[PDB]
């Protein structure tokens, strides 16, 4: 997250990093045994974490899980990124509490203007490369469609939207990837792709789960 502030321990209890002997990407806690992240993070043998602030440091809070399953969207294209999700059930269900918690799934897609907080352990600078030790936040509106296709052309999809500021200074990065865009309460948008990070006219651009929740539901419910 480039340009955001200090979440605050466990203030984003649906929070999860994906570990693969090292944190690669974020996820979204979306029930005790199910997390929702972006397809672009598949990778065998992921370790969930959860409850986690400082991910280099074991603070007490934490649950560590292992995937036994990771389900990619049928429909996912690696080079468009369309259809940029994917479903990973946890070995054992999560325990639930103050710091480890589930968030909504939409059942309304979310309205351009809106606030939404992004998180994740992702690169903090524009240009060169630092990695934080706890969770950064970030607040960013839904750009316009048609800002976003114009800052994208022939590559926005109807699966997808942008976030974030035009002038720059302000978005999710990578190893943010995966990670929650959450909007009035429900998990609206996946850390998906951008050019570059908080670059002028090159906003965030986000898996849009809203078109989703059909597929989501009816894979938990035979998985
Ligand atoms: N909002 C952005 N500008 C943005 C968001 C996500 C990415 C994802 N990169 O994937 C590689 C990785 O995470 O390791 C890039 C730019
Ligand atoms: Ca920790």
Redesign the pocket.
Known sequence: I?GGYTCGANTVPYQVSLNSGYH??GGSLINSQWVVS?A??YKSGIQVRLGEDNINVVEGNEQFISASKSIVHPSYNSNTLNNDIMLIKLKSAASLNSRVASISLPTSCASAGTQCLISGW?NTKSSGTSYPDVLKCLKAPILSDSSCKSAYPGQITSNMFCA?YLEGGK????????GPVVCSGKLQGI?????????KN?????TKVCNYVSWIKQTIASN
């Open positions: 480039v690669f990407c972006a672009h993070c992702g974030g978005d999710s990065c990578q190893g943010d990837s995966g850390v998906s792709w951008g050019s570059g990070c908080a670059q090159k906003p965030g651009v986000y």
